[PDB]
């Protein structure tokens with residue numbers, strides 16, 4: 001559903017328009033060739049043109065497949081990689097890996113195989129590409145092309161860039177619509193924040209805090225920010241669309257109430273990965289409850305309402321009694337200094353509630369007051385049933401440890417301690433992070449699962465920062481706008497837009 005003249009809109013600028021970009025973009029190999037989706041492709045495409053580099057991309061691709069290969073098929077895929085890339089007479093032989101590293105990874109295969117057999121060689125490969133190949137790509141026409149894509153990425157974003165459809169959701173500070181990018185046709189969900197309502201309630205720094213947190217995290221399991229623009233009477237956050245419902249609905253309306261343990265395992269594993277990505281930015285979510293875990297078209301889940309999220313200064317704690325009754329960790333209820341520990345308590349609440357069909361401190365058929373619900377969270381030991389395996393009972397009561405110091409995942413190890421818990425003994429997190437595990441429930445597509453101050457002007461410029469880099473480049477790729485516009489001259493020659501002779 002791209003606009004009729006979308007090639008006019010995403011028309012590349014002439015390379016001469018990008019000289020300011022060429023001298024302001026930092027030339028970090030990991031950023032330009034890996035983190036940024038379109039840079040990664042363009043650099044990979046540069047190595048396709050060279051005979052020697054070609055084989056280093058193919059090899060890294062086969063190591064990626066090795067990491068997510070099933071355990072009982074490792075020895076099979078490992079030998080294949082060895083005999084194809086690490087044999088002296090191979091036509092696609094890897095040379096920069098010293099023979100003291102090809103004969104070393106021979107021994108790993110002479111014994112049991114691990115998922116990281118080729119981690120030693122993959123870094124050796126990357127260390128080579130960082131140097132001579134990367135600096136050649138900088139002086140190649142593929143980096144000029146990257147500068148053209150960046151020039152587009154930075155173009156201003158306004159109401160016309162989008163196309164609002166239906167008001168799908170409401171709440172506080174505004175409503176949530178469903179929009180579409182006219183030029184690419186990709187769907188998002190606007191979070192229209194009414195302008196007059198923010199100044200009145202005096203929550204400007206809270207609206208920025210959420211926008212900053214959303215754009216800084218890029219996770220498969222948290223809603224991502226793709227655009228932030230201002231308009232008349234509102235500020236807009238363009239977020240990942242979640243059309244599959246929310247976990248609360250599936251627990252109580254589609255559930256028994258509740259899920260099978262294996263089904264709750266899948267959602268728990270994805271939620272745990274979401275929290276881990278947030279904690280990589282020392283950001284605590286503080287708002288874990290089932291109605292905030294949303295499902296998508298394919299049945300995967302993302303954490304949603306980041307309105308109560310805050311970035312902890314490293315080495316420092318925060319105070320704040322905030323959340324929803326029944327999902328506040330004991331240290332939050334007491335209004336103490338805490339860090340990331342509330343999110344692991346919230347994870348305990350979620351695994352328990354998914355499995356049992358009710359909250360661990362309030363019966364589904366129980367009428368109790370906020371005071372009793374809070375007393376239980378601070379003084380009562382939750383009980384379990386035959387719906388829980390011993391492994392499930394363990395992780396839940398370890399995560400529901402009242403004392404945040406002895407609570408699972410609240411150590412220096414972090415989320416790694418949780419992924420190692422026997423409750424995930426049968427879960428492969430590499431394959432889960434790669435989207436290779438079929439969700440337990442796939443939503444049906446057609447389904448419906450349910451004033452003139454200047455201080456206000458300065459507050460907008462910090463918020464309305466335009467498009468977000470990684471999501472924008474991923475949009476251009478999903479919609480095949482990249483595949484379509486990224487064209488060069490016939491037989492590896494310069495197209496006109498990259499030739500400084502005739503503009």
Ligand SMILES: Cc1[nH]c(/C=C2\C(=O)Nc3ccc(C(=O)N[C@H](C)c4ccc(F)cc4)cc32)c(C)c1NC(=O)[C@@H]1CCC(=O)O1
Pocket residue numbers: 168169170171172173174175176177178189191192193194223239240241242243244245246294304305306307447448449450
């Ligand atoms: C197509 C779409 N999008 C959604 C919402 C969301 C989404 O996708 N990501 C989100 C990320 C964060 C938040 C959030 O925390 N919102 C707070 C409350 C808020 C509200 C108003 C404000 F002004 C500010 C904050 C919300 C969202 C929904 C339910 C649907 N529809 C549907 O799920 C169903 C299924 C299929 C259909 O057609 O109906």
